[PDB]
Amino acid sequence: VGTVVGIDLGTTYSCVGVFKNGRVEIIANDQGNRITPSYVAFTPEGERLIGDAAKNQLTSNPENTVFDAKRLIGRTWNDPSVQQDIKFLPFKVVEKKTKPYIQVDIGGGQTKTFAPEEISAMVLTKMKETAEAYLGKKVTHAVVTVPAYFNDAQRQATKDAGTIAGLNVMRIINEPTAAAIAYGLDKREGEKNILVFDLGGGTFDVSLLTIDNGVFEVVATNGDTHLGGEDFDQRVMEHFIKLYKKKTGKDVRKDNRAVQKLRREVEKAKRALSSQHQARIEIESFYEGEDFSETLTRAKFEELNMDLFRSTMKPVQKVLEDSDLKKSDIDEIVLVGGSTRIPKIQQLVKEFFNGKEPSRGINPDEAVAYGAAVQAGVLSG
Ligand SMILES: Nc1ncnc2c1ncn2[C@@H]1O[C@H](COP(=O)(O)OP(=O)(O)CP(=O)(O)O)[C@@H](O)[C@H]1O
Ligand SMILES: [Mg+2]
C-alpha cells in the first residue's frame, strides 16, 4: 500500500493529507495552496488545466470549463436532480450510457465527452500528484471522502474516479465523520450526539451523527445543495457591479473577463475579511481600459449576506426535529467547510446553541481531508 493518502474530493475545493512522522500533514499544491479547486479547463493549444490554473484561466468561454461534476457523479442522466442542476451549468451535459456526460471543446475544434467520474478522476490525479511531489514517491492507495447522503452508485462512481486516476480507493468514508475523526471525537467514552455544520463553496450540509464505542452512525442529514460561499461572493459582486454602474454609467457584465476578474478579487477579499476588518479590491484594465479600486469592510460584507447567514439555521433545526433531539442534546458541534471561517458564521452557530463552543483547532476546509489522513495513517502502518 505504501503511503496511503487522505483526499477530500470536494464539490468546489479538494484537499489532500498524509500521516507522516507522527502527525497529519496537509499538502500544498504546486501553486502553494492547501486546497485545490475541483476545476478543469483547456488552453487554445489543447492542453488540459486542472485546479488553480483552470479556475484562474481568463476566458470568454465558460462553456469549455468543467466544475461541480460532484453534483452529477453516480447519477443517471434522467435523475431530476441532474435535470435541475444542468440548468445552472454553463457547459454541455448530454445523455450517454444512461449518464450525464460532459461535452466540451478543448482546442482546435476538438470536442470531447467525459463521464462525471472522468472529470473527478482528473481532480484526483491532481491531488495524487500534489501528494507525490510532497512525498518524493508514487502514491497508489487512498482514503476518499464523500458526503453523508451519498448513495450506492455515487460511492461506487467515486471509487471508479479513483481507479481511472490510478488510485485504489481502500475506503470511502463520510465527510462529516472524517471531520469528527480529525477532532478525535471517536476516541471518547459514552454515547454522544454530534452536529456537523458544513458550509462549503456551493453547498450547505448539516449532519447529525452519534458516536458510541468508536462507531459513528449518521442519524440524519439536511442542508441546502445550492447555498454556500459562492452565494456570498455573488452578493458582493452585485454590490460592486451596482456601485461601478452608479459611478461610471457602465454595466461590467457585458464583459465576462471583467466579471471573472472581479469574482477572483472578491473571493480573495472575502477570505481576508475572515481575519481582518477591511480589504481592498483592485483591478487594472478592469473595464474598457479603466481601473477598479474599492474597499470592503467586514461589516459591509456581513450586511450584504446577513439574511443568507441566518437561513443556515433552518436546516439545523430540521435535523434536530427529525432526530427527535433538542439543542441541549448536542454534545459536540463541529464546523466544516471554508465558509465556517467567517467570524459571523461562527458567532451565529454559537448563538443557535446558546453559547456552546464548537470544536476548534483544525482549519475547517482542511478537517475532512485531515480525518481521511488519520485513517490513511493507520492503513499505511
Ligand atoms: N478564509 C476564508 N473565509 C471565508 N470563506 C472562505 C475562506 N477560505 C475558503 N473560503 C470559502 O470556502 C468555500 C469552499 O469551501 P469548501 O472547500 O468546504 O467546499 P467543498 O468543496 O468542500 C463543498 P462539499 O463539502 O459539498 O464537497 C469557498 O466559497 C471559499 O471562498
Ligand atoms: Mg466539503
Curated annotation (Swiss-Prot):
The residues forming a coiled coil are none
Modification type Phosphoserine: residues: S60
Protein keywords: Acetylation, ATP-binding, Chaperone, Cytoplasm, Endoplasmic reticulum, Host-virus interaction, Hydrolase, Isopeptide bond, Methylation, Nitration, Nucleotide-binding, Phosphoprotein, Signal, Ubl conjugation
What post-translational changes are documented for it? AMPylated by FICD. In response to endoplasmic reticulum stress, de-AMPylation by the same protein, FICD, restores the chaperone activity.
Q: Cross-link of type Glycyl lysine isopeptide (Lys-Gly) (interchain with G-Cter in SUMO1): positions?
A: K327
Induction statement:
By endoplasmic reticulum stress. Induced in nasal epithelial cells by high free iron levels. Induced in nasal epithelial cells in high glucose. Induced in nasal epithelial cells by 3-hydroxybutyric acid (BHB).
* Record-listed cross-link Glycyl lysine isopeptide (Lys-Gly) (interchain with G-Cter in SUMO2), residues: K326
GO CC field: cell surface; cytoplasm; cytosol; endoplasmic reticulum; endoplasmic reticulum chaperone complex; endoplasmic reticulum lumen; endoplasmic reticulum membrane; endoplasmic reticulum-Golgi intermediate compartment
Its biotechnological use is: Antibodies against the protein protects endothelial cells from invasion by the fungus R.delemar, a causative agent of mucormycosis, and could thus potentially be used to treat mucormycosis disease. Antibodies against the protein also protect a diabetic ketoacidosis mouse model against mucormycosis.
Q: Which EC numbers does the record give?
A: 3.6.4.10
Post-translational modification 3'-nitrotyrosine, affected residues: Y134
Give positions of region: Nucleotide-binding (NBD): 99-254
Q: Where in the cell is it found?
A: Endoplasmic reticulum lumen; Melanosome; Cytoplasm; Cell surface
Which residues are modified to N6-acetyllysine? K99, K187, K245, K300, K327
Summarizing activity control, the record says: The chaperone activity is regulated by ATP-induced allosteric coupling of the nucleotide-binding (NBD) and substrate-binding (SBD) domains. In the ADP-bound and nucleotide-free (apo) states, the two domains have little interaction. In contrast, in the ATP-bound state the two domains are tightly coupled, which results in drastically accelerated kinetics in both binding and release of polypeptide substrates. J domain-containing co-chaperones (DNAJB9/ERdj4 or DNAJC10/ERdj5) stimulate the ATPase activity and are required for efficient substrate recognition by HSPA5/BiP.
Q: Which disease is it linked to?
A: Autoantigen in rheumatoid arthritis.
According to the UniProt entry, the note on domains is: The interdomain linker regulates the chaperone activity by mediating the formation of homooligomers. Homooligomers are formed by engagement of the interdomain linker of one HSPA5/BiP molecule as a typical substrate of an adjacent HSPA5/BiP molecule. HSPA5/BiP oligomerization inactivates participating HSPA5/BiP protomers. HSPA5/BiP oligomers probably act as reservoirs to store HSPA5/BiP molecules when they are not needed by the cell. When the levels of unfolded proteins rise, cells can rapidly break up these oligomers to make active monomers.
Q: Its quaternary structure?
A: Monomer and homooligomer; homooligomerization via the interdomain linker inactivates the chaperone activity and acts as a storage of HSPA5/BiP molecules. Interacts with DNAJC1 (via J domain). Component of an EIF2 complex at least composed of CELF1/CUGBP1, CALR, CALR3, EIF2S1, EIF2S2, HSP90B1 and HSPA5. Part of a large chaperone multiprotein complex comprising DNAJB11, HSP90B1, HSPA5, HYOU, PDIA2, PDIA4, PDIA6, PPIB, SDF2L1, UGGT1 and very small amounts of ERP29, but not, or at very low levels, CALR nor CANX. Interacts with TMEM132A and TRIM21. (Microbial infection) Interacts with Japanese encephalitis virus envelope protein E.
What protein name is recorded for this chain? Answer: Endoplasmic reticulum chaperone BiP
Organism equals Homo sapiens (Human)
